[PDB]
Motif scaffolding. Structure first.
Motif, PDB file in Angstrom:
ATOM      1  N   UNK A   6       0.833  -1.194   0.000  1.00 16.84           N
ATOM      2  CA  UNK A   6       0.000   0.000   0.000  1.00 16.84           C
ATOM      3  C   UNK A   6       0.865   1.239   0.000  1.00 16.84           C
ATOM      4  N   UNK A   7       1.856   1.219   0.884  1.00 19.49           N
ATOM      5  CA  UNK A   7       2.732   2.387   0.991  1.00 19.49           C
ATOM      6  C   UNK A   7       3.625   2.572  -0.208  1.00 19.49           C
ATOM      7  N   UNK A   8       4.032   1.492  -0.833  1.00 16.20           N
ATOM      8  CA  UNK A   8       4.860   1.606  -1.990  1.00 16.20           C
ATOM      9  C   UNK A   8       4.071   2.260  -3.120  1.00 16.20           C
ATOM     10  N   UNK A   9       2.751   2.043  -3.139  1.00 10.95           N
ATOM     11  CA  UNK A   9       1.900   2.667  -4.157  1.00 10.95           C
ATOM     12  C   UNK A   9       1.784   4.175  -3.877  1.00 10.95           C
ATOM     13  N   UNK A  10       1.520   4.535  -2.644  1.00 14.45           N
ATOM     14  CA  UNK A  10       1.383   5.944  -2.259  1.00 14.45           C
ATOM     15  C   UNK A  10       2.646   6.825  -2.310  1.00 14.45           C
ATOM     16  N   UNK A  11       3.790   6.249  -2.029  1.00 21.08           N
ATOM     17  CA  UNK A  11       5.010   7.009  -1.919  1.00 21.08           C
ATOM     18  C   UNK A  11       5.958   6.894  -3.113  1.00 21.08           C
ATOM     19  N   UNK A  12       5.895   5.788  -3.866  1.00 25.44           N
ATOM     20  CA  UNK A  12       6.809   5.599  -4.991  1.00 25.44           C
ATOM     21  C   UNK A  12       8.161   5.142  -4.483  1.00 25.44           C
ATOM     22  N   UNK A  13       9.117   4.938  -5.368  1.00 30.73           N
ATOM     23  CA  UNK A  13      10.454   4.560  -4.956  1.00 30.73           C
ATOM     24  C   UNK A  13      11.398   5.418  -5.758  1.00 30.73           C
ATOM     25  N   UNK A  14      12.310   6.128  -5.130  1.00 34.16           N
ATOM     26  CA  UNK A  14      13.254   6.986  -5.835  1.00 34.16           C
ATOM     27  C   UNK A  14      14.616   6.726  -5.244  1.00 34.16           C
ATOM     28  N   UNK A  15      15.594   6.473  -6.101  1.00 33.26           N
ATOM     29  CA  UNK A  15      16.914   6.142  -5.622  1.00 33.26           C
ATOM     30  C   UNK A  15      17.876   7.292  -5.528  1.00 33.26           C
ATOM     31  N   UNK A  16      17.413   8.510  -5.877  1.00 33.67           N
ATOM     32  CA  UNK A  16      18.273   9.715  -5.809  1.00 33.67           C
ATOM     33  C   UNK A  16      17.561  10.726  -4.896  1.00 33.67           C
ATOM     34  N   UNK A  17      18.280  11.575  -4.077  1.00 29.71           N
ATOM     35  CA  UNK A  17      17.575  12.555  -3.189  1.00 29.71           C
ATOM     36  C   UNK A  17      16.556  13.281  -4.005  1.00 29.71           C
ATOM     37  N   UNK A  18      15.375  13.493  -3.450  1.00 34.43           N
ATOM     38  CA  UNK A  18      14.320  14.204  -4.158  1.00 34.43           C
ATOM     39  C   UNK A  18      13.569  15.092  -3.202  1.00 34.43           C
ATOM     40  N   UNK A  19      12.702  15.956  -3.714  1.00 35.53           N
ATOM     41  CA  UNK A  19      11.907  16.811  -2.847  1.00 35.53           C
ATOM     42  C   UNK A  19      10.494  16.261  -2.814  1.00 35.53           C
ATOM     43  N   UNK A  20       9.952  16.133  -1.633  1.00 32.30           N
ATOM     44  CA  UNK A  20       8.636  15.597  -1.506  1.00 32.30           C
ATOM     45  C   UNK A  20       7.571  16.617  -1.903  1.00 32.30           C
ATOM     46  N   UNK A  21       6.303  16.341  -1.633  1.00 32.35           N
ATOM     47  CA  UNK A  21       5.268  17.279  -2.051  1.00 32.35           C
ATOM     48  C   UNK A  21       5.403  18.543  -1.275  1.00 32.35           C
ATOM     49  N   UNK A  22       5.952  18.480  -0.049  1.00 33.29           N
ATOM     50  CA  UNK A  22       6.095  19.679   0.789  1.00 33.29           C
ATOM     51  C   UNK A  22       7.381  20.449   0.535  1.00 33.29           C
ATOM     52  N   UNK A  23       8.202  19.893  -0.332  1.00 31.70           N
ATOM     53  CA  UNK A  23       9.459  20.464  -0.691  1.00 31.70           C
ATOM     54  C   UNK A  23      10.581  19.960   0.166  1.00 31.70           C
ATOM     55  N   UNK A  24      10.387  18.892   0.924  1.00 36.57           N
ATOM     56  CA  UNK A  24      11.504  18.446   1.713  1.00 36.57           C
ATOM     57  C   UNK A  24      12.282  17.328   1.084  1.00 36.57           C
ATOM     58  N   UNK A  25      13.542  17.312   1.447  1.00 39.00           N
ATOM     59  CA  UNK A  25      14.518  16.340   0.984  1.00 39.00           C
ATOM     60  C   UNK A  25      14.175  14.941   1.504  1.00 39.00           C
ATOM     61  N   UNK A  26      13.968  14.008   0.559  1.00 28.87           N
ATOM     62  CA  UNK A  26      13.516  12.639   0.802  1.00 28.87           C
ATOM     63  C   UNK A  26      14.315  11.711  -0.109  1.00 28.87           C
ATOM     64  N   UNK A  27      14.319  10.430   0.211  1.00 30.08           N
ATOM     65  CA  UNK A  27      14.926   9.422  -0.617  1.00 30.08           C
ATOM     66  C   UNK A  27      14.147   8.115  -0.451  1.00 30.08           C
ATOM     67  N   UNK A  28      14.323   7.149  -1.329  1.00 31.63           N
ATOM     68  CA  UNK A  28      13.672   5.841  -1.197  1.00 31.63           C
ATOM     69  C   UNK A  28      12.167   5.835  -1.342  1.00 31.63           C
ATOM     70  N   UNK A  29      11.547   5.176  -0.363  1.00 32.69           N
ATOM     71  CA  UNK A  29      10.093   5.058  -0.262  1.00 32.69           C
ATOM     72  C   UNK A  29       9.553   5.983   0.811  1.00 32.69           C
ATOM     73  N   UNK A  30       9.515   7.275   0.487  1.00 33.18           N
ATOM     74  CA  UNK A  30       9.023   8.306   1.364  1.00 33.18           C
ATOM     75  C   UNK A  30       9.860   8.514   2.632  1.00 33.18           C
TER      76      UNK A  30
END
Length: 164
Positions: A6-30
């Protein structure tokens, strides 16, 4: 379907630092790294979290390891929380997944802030609670994900995700 899928569907998977919907620095699965504006602060947190010099990038394995830790910590958090535990204990297995999902996204503190909705869930007033949950910044900011979670509490089935 289970909490992980369920969570993998909602959050996605990203292997490089990214910005979340709020603009914060995130990696992986949320996995939130920092609320700090510094990509450098983010890369430091990342290395600390993984135990290696990642240089802003991680493997699938590392992403999953972080995910396992976060789901575990979310569950343990609910069970230790005085406002959350009773609700959790009162729910069936699918709805428990919906509460864990909220906690993973917004933290214990945040969910504990939904006083009225929690009371309705405990009471098993499904429709009422779905309507109340929708009156939040959460729903306005991430409406499709909020709707999926909301449908999960409303129906007690995985229909919102069987699509996806």
């Amino acid at each position: 379907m289970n909490i992980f899928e369920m969570l993998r569907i909602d959050e996605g998977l990203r292997l490089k630092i990214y910005k979340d919907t709020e603009g914060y620095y995130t990696i992986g699965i949320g996995h939130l790294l920092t609320k700090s504006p510094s990509l450098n602060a983010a890369k430091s947190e990342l290395d600390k979290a993984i135990g290696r010099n990642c240089n802003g990038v991680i493997t699938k394995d590392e992403a999953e390891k972080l995910f396992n830790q976060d789901v575990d910590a979310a569950v343990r958090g609910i069970l230790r929380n005085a406002k959350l535990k009773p609700v959790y204990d009162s729910l069936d297995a699918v709805r428990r997944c919906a509460l864990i999902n909220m906690v993973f996204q917004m933290g214990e503190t945040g969910v504990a802030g939904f006083e009225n909705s929690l009371r309705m869930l405990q009471q098993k007033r499904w429709d009422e609670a779905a309507v109340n949950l929708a009156k939040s910044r959460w729903y306005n900011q991430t409406p499709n994900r909020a709707k999926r979670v909301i449908t999960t509490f409303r129906t007690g089935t995985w229909d919102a995700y069987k699509n996806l």
